[PDB]
DNA sequence: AAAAAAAAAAAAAAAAAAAAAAAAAAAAAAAAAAAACACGTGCCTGGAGACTAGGGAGTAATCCCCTTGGCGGTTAAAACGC
């Protein structure tokens, strides 16, 4: 009961993580997007109690299409509460492979001391965190969520020059939004929202991450 | 006829339900500093190996002294009763 449900939720979480990596412009193959539950059972195992697969066994490294040295790690700790010891273990793994992006998927909780740790290690390495309950549902696949596109700084400058817009008088989106966490949006970026309009067909808006 | 005390008129003064946001108290886990039986390490004094040689214990023979065994005579000690 626990093994089958754990394997099912691990496969669903891995599929959600792979779709998140595909949505962020990273080098993602089609078979990992279309990995079935039986494919996950054959590749990794079906009994998570006896380490088949282990929580550290499933570790995902993905690369970017344009810049191959820009890569992301995905970490699955087994413990419910995350201390600074395992964060420092991931960090000591993280400098020795010369990569600036990783996401740790917590299970139960992750301490405010480690919150402050992730705050003050931020402008060298990006170490995002995610809850296991939030990664059982793809956010962008919902019918209430329109299309979100991350936009570069040159197109942002073109948007500011075309409409005579300033950044403080733009439409805003909080940095703690689940959509912004899904795309990994930082403060100062502008996301483009394409939605269906019943009076014009489709509409495009621009939101500032704050 | 003038001075003092009590009575009364006139004038000033105090006296309804609901919801969001913030402050606060009890609690509670996470993380960073001083103790403490036994472990790490080096030294040495006592434990261990070998040879000699001797003196204290085992073995053989004897005996006689001490120990065991029986049989009988009152008889004081024991047993029974009130």
């Amino acid at each position: 009961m626990d093994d089958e449900a754990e394997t099912y939720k691990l496969w669903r979480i891995r599929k959600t993580i792979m779709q998140l990596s595909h949505d962020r412009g990273y080098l993602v193959t089609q078979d990992e997007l279309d990995q079935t539950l039986e494919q996950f059972k054959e590749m990794f195992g079906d009994k998570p109690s006896e380490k088949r697969p282990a929580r550290s066994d499933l570790i995902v490294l993905v690369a970017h299409n344009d810049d191959p040295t820009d890569q992301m790690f995905v970490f699955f700790p087994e413990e419910p509460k995350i201390g600074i010891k395992t964060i420092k273990t991931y960090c000591t793994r993280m400098q020795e492979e010369n990569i600036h992006r990783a996401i740790v998927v917590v299970q139960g909780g992750m301490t405010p001391s480690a919150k402050q740790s992730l705050v003050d290690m931020a402008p060298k390495y990006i170490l995002e965190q995610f809850l296991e309950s939030e990664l059982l549902i793809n956010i962008t696949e919902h019918e209430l969520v329109p299309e979100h596109v991350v936009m570069t700084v040159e197109e942002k400058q073109e948007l500011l020059s075309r409409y005579k817009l300033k950044e403080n008088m733009l439409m805003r989106i909080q940095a703690g939004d689940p959509v912004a966490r899904y795309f990994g949006l930082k403060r100062g970026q502008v996301v483009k929202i394409i939605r269906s309009s019943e009076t014009a067909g489709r509409y495009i808006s621009y939101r500032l991450v704050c």
Side-chain angles (χ1 to χ4, degrees), chain A residues 1-185 188-210:
Chain A
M1 201 295 299
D2 287 301
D3 287 293
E4 190 75 29
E6 197 82 19
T7 314
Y8 182 75
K9 71 177 288 187
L10 273 170
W11 163 71
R12 178 176 282 175
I13 279 164
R14 186 184 175 87
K15 177 172 287 301
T16 303
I17 287 297
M18 204 72 202
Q19 284 173 342
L20 188 141
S21 292
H22 182 74
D23 278 347
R24 285 187 184 187
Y26 286 156
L27 178 60
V28 164
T29 70
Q30 56 92 28
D31 71 317
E32 292 159 302
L33 291 171
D34 294 300
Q35 186 177 231
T36 71
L37 179 60
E38 291 91 4
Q39 275 176 248
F40 180 74
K41 281 163 136 169
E42 286 146 14
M43 187 177 288
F44 285 98
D46 52 353
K47 300 286 100 176
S49 54
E50 43 260 24
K51 270 85 177 175
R52 46 183 69 186
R55 295 298 310 275
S56 68
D57 195 73
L58 304 148
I59 171 172
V60 174
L61 178 60
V62 70
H64 191 256
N65 290 314
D66 314 333
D67 192 56
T69 187
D70 174 43
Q71 292 185 0
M72 192 162 63
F73 292 100
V74 186
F75 296 115
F76 319 102
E78 52 91 20
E79 65 271 11
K81 189 58 72 70
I82 301 303
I84 316 174
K85 271 82 69 178
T86 54
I87 292 298
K88 254 59 167 177
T89 307
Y90 288 148
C91 281
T92 46
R93 193 165 179 175
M94 192 69 201
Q95 293 90 21
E96 58 91 18
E97 291 174 352
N98 292 319
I99 295 169
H100 310 269
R101 187 70 57 87
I103 291 181
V104 180
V105 180
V106 311
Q107 201 266 330
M110 183 300 296
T111 64
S113 59
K115 287 181 180 178
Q116 286 300 318
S117 86
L118 296 197
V119 166
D120 72 340
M121 63 81 71
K124 174 176 171 47
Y125 292 141
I126 301 299
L127 195 40
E128 315 169 1
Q129 69 105 28
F130 262 96
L131 183 63
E132 269 203 344
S133 178
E134 304 183 350
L135 288 173
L136 293 165
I137 288 301
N138 206 333
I139 294 96
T140 60
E141 290 184 340
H142 204 278
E143 83 167 348
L144 289 188
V145 187
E147 176 147 35
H148 296 256
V149 171
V150 62
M151 188 175 71
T152 64
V153 289
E154 291 88 4
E155 311 162 281
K156 158 166 163 179
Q157 190 51 254
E158 284 181 354
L159 166 70
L160 294 189
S161 296
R162 153 77 193 86
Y163 277 113
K164 311 292 288 297
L165 273 160
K166 292 177 72 174
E167 59 174 1
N168 51 349
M169 50 164 288
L170 291 173
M171 186 64 72
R172 267 174 261 275
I173 176 173
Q174 291 184 331
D177 200 281
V179 173
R181 283 171 60 196
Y182 193 90
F183 279 79
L185 306 178
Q189 287 188 293
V190 171
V191 63
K192 170 168 77 173
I193 290 174
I194 319 175
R195 82 176 81 112
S196 286
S197 176
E198 60 157 287
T199 44
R202 74 180 74 253
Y203 184 66
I204 284 186
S205 66
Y206 304 93
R207 282 195 184 267
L208 176 80
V209 186
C210 67

Tab-separated table of all heavy atoms in Angstrom, chain A residues 142-169:
chain	number	residue	atom	x	y	z
A	142	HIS	N	-3.697	23.697	-15.783
A	142	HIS	CA	-5.052	23.989	-15.339
A	142	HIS	C	-5.765	24.887	-16.344
A	142	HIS	O	-5.146	25.698	-17.040
A	142	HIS	CB	-5.031	24.653	-13.962
A	142	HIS	CG	-6.303	24.491	-13.190
A	142	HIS	ND1	-7.401	25.302	-13.384
A	142	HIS	CD2	-6.653	23.612	-12.221
A	142	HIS	CE1	-8.371	24.930	-12.569
A	142	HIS	NE2	-7.944	23.906	-11.853
A	143	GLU	N	-7.090	24.734	-16.416
A	143	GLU	CA	-7.886	25.509	-17.363
A	143	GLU	C	-8.039	26.967	-16.946
A	143	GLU	O	-8.392	27.803	-17.786
A	143	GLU	CB	-9.262	24.859	-17.544
A	143	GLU	CG	-10.288	25.215	-16.479
A	143	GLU	CD	-11.695	24.806	-16.865
A	143	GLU	OE1	-11.912	24.456	-18.044
A	143	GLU	OE2	-12.584	24.829	-15.987
A	144	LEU	N	-7.783	27.293	-15.681
A	144	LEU	CA	-7.854	28.668	-15.211
A	144	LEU	C	-6.538	29.415	-15.367
A	144	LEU	O	-6.508	30.634	-15.172
A	144	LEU	CB	-8.282	28.700	-13.739
A	144	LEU	CG	-9.732	28.320	-13.431
A	144	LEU	CD1	-10.053	28.584	-11.968
A	144	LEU	CD2	-10.696	29.070	-14.337
A	145	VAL	N	-5.464	28.722	-15.721
A	145	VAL	CA	-4.137	29.320	-15.840
A	145	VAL	C	-3.841	29.530	-17.321
A	145	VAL	O	-3.749	28.544	-18.067
A	145	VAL	CB	-3.063	28.445	-15.179
A	145	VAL	CG1	-1.729	29.173	-15.165
A	145	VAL	CG2	-3.486	28.086	-13.767
A	146	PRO	N	-3.688	30.770	-17.783
A	146	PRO	CA	-3.354	31.010	-19.194
A	146	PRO	C	-1.887	30.751	-19.506
A	146	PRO	O	-1.148	30.232	-18.666
A	146	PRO	CB	-3.717	32.485	-19.384
A	146	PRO	CG	-3.494	33.080	-18.041
A	146	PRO	CD	-3.893	32.028	-17.044
A	147	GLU	N	-1.458	31.096	-20.718
A	147	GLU	CA	-0.076	30.861	-21.117
A	147	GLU	C	0.837	31.928	-20.527
A	147	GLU	O	0.578	33.127	-20.670
A	147	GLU	CB	0.042	30.845	-22.641
A	147	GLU	CG	1.467	30.697	-23.151
A	147	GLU	CD	1.545	29.911	-24.444
A	147	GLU	OE1	0.620	30.035	-25.274
A	147	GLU	OE2	2.531	29.167	-24.629
A	148	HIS	N	1.908	31.491	-19.869
A	148	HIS	CA	2.928	32.382	-19.331
A	148	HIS	C	4.240	32.137	-20.061
A	148	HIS	O	4.675	30.988	-20.193
A	148	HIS	CB	3.118	32.168	-17.828
A	148	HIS	CG	1.911	32.502	-17.009
A	148	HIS	ND1	1.814	33.654	-16.260
A	148	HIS	CD2	0.756	31.824	-16.808
A	148	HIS	CE1	0.648	33.676	-15.639
A	148	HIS	NE2	-0.013	32.578	-15.957
A	149	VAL	N	4.863	33.212	-20.535
A	149	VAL	CA	6.113	33.144	-21.283
A	149	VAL	C	7.123	34.049	-20.591
A	149	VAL	O	6.853	35.236	-20.373
A	149	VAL	CB	5.919	33.557	-22.753
A	149	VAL	CG1	7.257	33.688	-23.462
A	149	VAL	CG2	5.029	32.557	-23.481
A	150	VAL	N	8.281	33.489	-20.237
A	150	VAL	CA	9.369	34.303	-19.710
A	150	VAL	C	9.981	35.106	-20.855
A	150	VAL	O	10.103	34.619	-21.988
A	150	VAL	CB	10.393	33.422	-18.967
A	150	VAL	CG1	11.057	32.392	-19.886
A	150	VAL	CG2	11.439	34.271	-18.244
A	151	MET	N	10.303	36.366	-20.585
A	151	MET	CA	10.703	37.302	-21.623
A	151	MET	C	12.058	37.907	-21.282
A	151	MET	O	12.330	38.237	-20.124
A	151	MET	CB	9.640	38.394	-21.793
A	151	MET	CG	9.859	39.309	-22.975
A	151	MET	SD	8.513	40.484	-23.209
A	151	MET	CE	8.774	41.572	-21.817
A	152	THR	N	12.907	38.048	-22.300
A	152	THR	CA	14.275	38.505	-22.118
A	152	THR	C	14.321	40.021	-21.923
A	152	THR	O	13.302	40.716	-21.965
A	152	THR	CB	15.136	38.086	-23.307
A	152	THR	OG1	14.668	38.743	-24.492
A	152	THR	CG2	15.064	36.580	-23.509
A	153	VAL	N	15.533	40.540	-21.718
A	153	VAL	CA	15.692	41.956	-21.407
A	153	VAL	C	15.626	42.821	-22.663
A	153	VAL	O	15.251	43.997	-22.584
A	153	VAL	CB	17.002	42.189	-20.633
A	153	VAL	CG1	16.891	41.622	-19.228
A	153	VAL	CG2	18.181	41.562	-21.365
A	154	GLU	N	15.984	42.273	-23.828
A	154	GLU	CA	15.901	43.046	-25.065
A	154	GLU	C	14.452	43.264	-25.481
A	154	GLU	O	14.073	44.370	-25.881
A	154	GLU	CB	16.683	42.347	-26.178
A	154	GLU	CG	18.192	42.341	-25.978
A	154	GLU	CD	18.675	41.151	-25.169
A	154	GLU	OE1	17.843	40.286	-24.825
A	154	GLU	OE2	19.887	41.083	-24.876
A	155	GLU	N	13.624	42.221	-25.375
A	155	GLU	CA	12.200	42.376	-25.645
A	155	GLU	C	11.520	43.226	-24.579
A	155	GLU	O	10.550	43.929	-24.879
A	155	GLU	CB	11.533	41.007	-25.740
A	155	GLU	CG	12.245	40.026	-26.651
A	155	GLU	CD	11.836	38.591	-26.386
A	155	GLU	OE1	12.339	37.999	-25.407
A	155	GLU	OE2	11.010	38.054	-27.152
A	156	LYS	N	12.021	43.181	-23.340
A	156	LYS	CA	11.523	44.072	-22.295
A	156	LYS	C	11.838	45.529	-22.615
A	156	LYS	O	10.988	46.411	-22.440
A	156	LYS	CB	12.114	43.663	-20.943
A	156	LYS	CG	12.125	44.750	-19.877
A	156	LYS	CD	12.394	44.164	-18.500
A	156	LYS	CE	12.816	45.241	-17.513
A	156	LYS	NZ	13.049	44.685	-16.151
A	157	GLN	N	13.051	45.794	-23.114
A	157	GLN	CA	13.420	47.143	-23.534
A	157	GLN	C	12.593	47.598	-24.731
A	157	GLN	O	12.210	48.771	-24.819
A	157	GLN	CB	14.913	47.195	-23.861
A	157	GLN	CG	15.458	48.595	-24.081
A	157	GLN	CD	15.099	49.542	-22.953
A	157	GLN	OE1	14.244	50.413	-23.106
A	157	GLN	NE2	15.754	49.373	-21.810
A	158	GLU	N	12.304	46.678	-25.655
A	158	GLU	CA	11.439	46.994	-26.791
A	158	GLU	C	10.015	47.308	-26.339
A	158	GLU	O	9.366	48.205	-26.890
A	158	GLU	CB	11.438	45.833	-27.784
A	158	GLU	CG	12.689	45.744	-28.639
A	158	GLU	CD	12.641	44.589	-29.618
A	158	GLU	OE1	11.678	43.796	-29.555
A	158	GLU	OE2	13.566	44.472	-30.448
A	159	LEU	N	9.515	46.572	-25.342
A	159	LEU	CA	8.188	46.835	-24.793
A	159	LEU	C	8.135	48.181	-24.077
A	159	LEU	O	7.146	48.915	-24.196
A	159	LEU	CB	7.786	45.700	-23.848
A	159	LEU	CG	6.591	45.914	-22.917
A	159	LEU	CD1	5.294	45.935	-23.707
A	159	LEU	CD2	6.552	44.842	-21.840
A	160	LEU	N	9.193	48.522	-23.333
A	160	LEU	CA	9.242	49.820	-22.665
A	160	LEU	C	9.380	50.968	-23.658
A	160	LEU	O	8.833	52.052	-23.427
A	160	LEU	CB	10.394	49.861	-21.657
A	160	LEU	CG	10.335	48.938	-20.436
A	160	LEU	CD1	11.438	49.288	-19.447
A	160	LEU	CD2	8.972	48.984	-19.764
A	161	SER	N	10.101	50.757	-24.760
A	161	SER	CA	10.272	51.816	-25.750
A	161	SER	C	9.026	51.997	-26.611
A	161	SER	O	8.715	53.121	-27.022
A	161	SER	CB	11.485	51.518	-26.630
A	161	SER	OG	12.679	51.517	-25.869
A	162	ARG	N	8.312	50.906	-26.903
A	162	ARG	CA	7.158	50.983	-27.795
A	162	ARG	C	5.975	51.672	-27.122
A	162	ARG	O	5.346	52.559	-27.711
A	162	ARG	CB	6.780	49.574	-28.269
A	162	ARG	CG	5.311	49.371	-28.634
A	162	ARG	CD	4.964	49.960	-29.995
A	162	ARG	NE	3.521	50.035	-30.190
A	162	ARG	CZ	2.764	51.049	-29.793
A	162	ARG	NH1	3.282	52.096	-29.173
A	162	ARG	NH2	1.454	51.009	-30.022
A	163	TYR	N	5.665	51.290	-25.886
A	163	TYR	CA	4.484	51.788	-25.197
A	163	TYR	C	4.788	52.946	-24.257
A	163	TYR	O	3.877	53.406	-23.558
A	163	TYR	CB	3.812	50.653	-24.421
A	163	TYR	CG	2.893	49.790	-25.254
A	163	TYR	CD1	3.210	48.463	-25.521
A	163	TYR	CD2	1.706	50.298	-25.767
A	163	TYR	CE1	2.372	47.666	-26.282
A	163	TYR	CE2	0.860	49.510	-26.528
A	163	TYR	CZ	1.199	48.195	-26.781
A	163	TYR	OH	0.362	47.407	-27.537
A	164	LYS	N	6.043	53.423	-24.243
A	164	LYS	CA	6.535	54.474	-23.337
A	164	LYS	C	6.279	54.119	-21.872
A	164	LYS	O	5.865	54.959	-21.070
A	164	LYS	CB	5.943	55.844	-23.686
A	164	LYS	CG	6.039	56.199	-25.161
A	164	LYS	CD	7.482	56.413	-25.586
A	164	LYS	CE	8.035	57.710	-25.021
A	164	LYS	NZ	7.307	58.897	-25.546
A	165	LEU	N	6.528	52.861	-21.525
A	165	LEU	CA	6.235	52.325	-20.205
A	165	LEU	C	7.459	52.418	-19.303
A	165	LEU	O	8.601	52.326	-19.760
A	165	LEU	CB	5.785	50.865	-20.302
A	165	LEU	CG	4.310	50.542	-20.545
A	165	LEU	CD1	4.165	49.125	-21.076
A	165	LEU	CD2	3.501	50.710	-19.277
A	166	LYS	N	7.207	52.608	-18.013
A	166	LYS	CA	8.222	52.488	-16.980
A	166	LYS	C	7.917	51.265	-16.125
A	166	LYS	O	6.786	50.777	-16.088
A	166	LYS	CB	8.286	53.746	-16.109
A	166	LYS	CG	8.792	54.981	-16.829
A	166	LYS	CD	8.748	56.193	-15.916
A	166	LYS	CE	9.822	56.112	-14.844
A	166	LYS	NZ	9.883	57.352	-14.024
A	167	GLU	N	8.949	50.769	-15.434
A	167	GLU	CA	8.820	49.491	-14.740
A	167	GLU	C	7.974	49.598	-13.475
A	167	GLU	O	7.323	48.621	-13.090
A	167	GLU	CB	10.205	48.924	-14.418
A	167	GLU	CG	11.077	49.811	-13.542
A	167	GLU	CD	12.369	49.132	-13.133
A	167	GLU	OE1	12.592	47.976	-13.551
A	167	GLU	OE2	13.158	49.752	-12.390
A	168	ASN	N	7.957	50.763	-12.824
A	168	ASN	CA	7.175	50.912	-11.601
A	168	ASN	C	5.682	51.020	-11.886
A	168	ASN	O	4.864	50.680	-11.024
A	168	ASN	CB	7.650	52.134	-10.814
A	168	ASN	CG	7.718	53.384	-11.666
A	168	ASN	OD1	7.602	53.324	-12.888
A	168	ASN	ND2	7.908	54.529	-11.020
A	169	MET	N	5.313	51.486	-13.078
A	169	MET	CA	3.919	51.638	-13.470
A	169	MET	C	3.425	50.487	-14.342
A	169	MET	O	2.407	50.633	-15.029
A	169	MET	CB	3.725	52.984	-14.172
A	169	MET	CG	4.728	53.255	-15.278
A	169	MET	SD	4.258	54.585	-16.403
A	169	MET	CE	2.938	53.814	-17.325
